[PDB]
Amino acid sequence: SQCSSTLVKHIKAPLHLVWSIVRRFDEPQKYKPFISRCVVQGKKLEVGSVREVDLKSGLPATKSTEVLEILDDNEHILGIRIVGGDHRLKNYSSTISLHSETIDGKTGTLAIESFVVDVPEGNTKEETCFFVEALIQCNLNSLADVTERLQAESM
Ligand SMILES: N#Cc1ccc(CC(=O)NC2(C(=O)O)CCCCC2)cc1C1CC1
């Protein structure tokens, strides 16, 4: 009644550049293709901040409310937990971390995101686990695009 997995992506951009995008707890839509809008109150990037996420139309759900559990600017770890919305996921937490990774003779970034989540009563472990992986890999392919496009424009 619980599945967990880890997804990775090699990114051809400097870690400081990927981190500047990944840490924006208040602007996930900057690269997450299925999120339309995001609102945060208070000091926006501090442990405990809460975001209300509006998803794109035409999806199984529309809203998500998430908390910022970890934001480590020295080690480049961002940890979030989802706590409300009109989706099917219970006790989802995840952690994305960035790591220096030489690619093509130049320095790049290796993005690693692990998640854990309850299996719904009426659903399979394999069926649950797999749907979230595919969404995260999409998020990380798009993260690589956005940061590589930014890196390019630095010339
Ligand atoms: N139904 C559905 C659904 C589809 C895409 C997103 C947007 C998204 O990308 N959501 C994750 C994220 O990394 O923000 C990756 C996938 C696991 C939830 C967190 C969110 C949700 C619901 C809030 C669960």
Swiss-Prot record:
Source species, domain of life: Eukaryota
Motif position, Gate loop: 57-61
Subunit and partners: Monomer. Forms heterodimer with PYL13, thus antagonizing PP2Cs-binding and ABA-independent inhibition of PP2Cs. Homodimer. Binds ABA on one subunit only. Binds to CARs protein in an ABA-independent manner, both at the plasma membrane and in the nucleus. Interacts with ABI1 and HAB1, and possibly with other PP2Cs, in an ABA-independent manner.
Keyword line: Abscisic acid signaling pathway, Cell membrane, Cytoplasm, Disulfide bond, Membrane, Nucleus, Protein phosphatase inhibitor, Receptor
Positions bearing the site annotation: Involved in ABA binding: 33, 80, 132, 135
UniProt-listed GO biological process terms: abscisic acid-activated signaling pathway
Assigned GO CC terms: cytoplasm; nucleus; plasma membrane
Short motif (Latch loop): ranges: 87-89
Protein name: Abscisic acid receptor PYL10
Coiled coil: none
Entry comment, domain topic: Upon interaction with ABA, the 'latch' and 'gate' loops change in conformation leading to a tight dimerization and the creation a surface that enables the receptor to dock into and inhibit the PP2C active site.
Chain segments carrying region START-like: 1-148
Protein family membership: Belongs to the PYR/PYL/RCAR abscisic acid intracellular receptor family.
Subcellular location field: Cytoplasm; Nucleus; Cell membrane
UniProt-recorded Gene Ontology molecular function terms: abscisic acid binding; protein homodimerization activity; protein phosphatase inhibitor activity; signaling receptor activity
Cysteine disulfide links: 3-129
Function: Receptor for abscisic acid (ABA) required for ABA-mediated responses such as stomatal closure and germination inhibition. Inhibits the activity of group-A protein phosphatases type 2C (PP2Cs) in an ABA-independent manner but more efficiently when activated by ABA. Can be activated by both (-)-ABA and (+)-ABA.
Residues the entry annotates as binding abscisate: 32, 61-66, 88-94, 113
Organism of provenance: Arabidopsis thaliana (Mouse-ear cress)
Site (Involved in interactions with PP2Cs): 60, 124
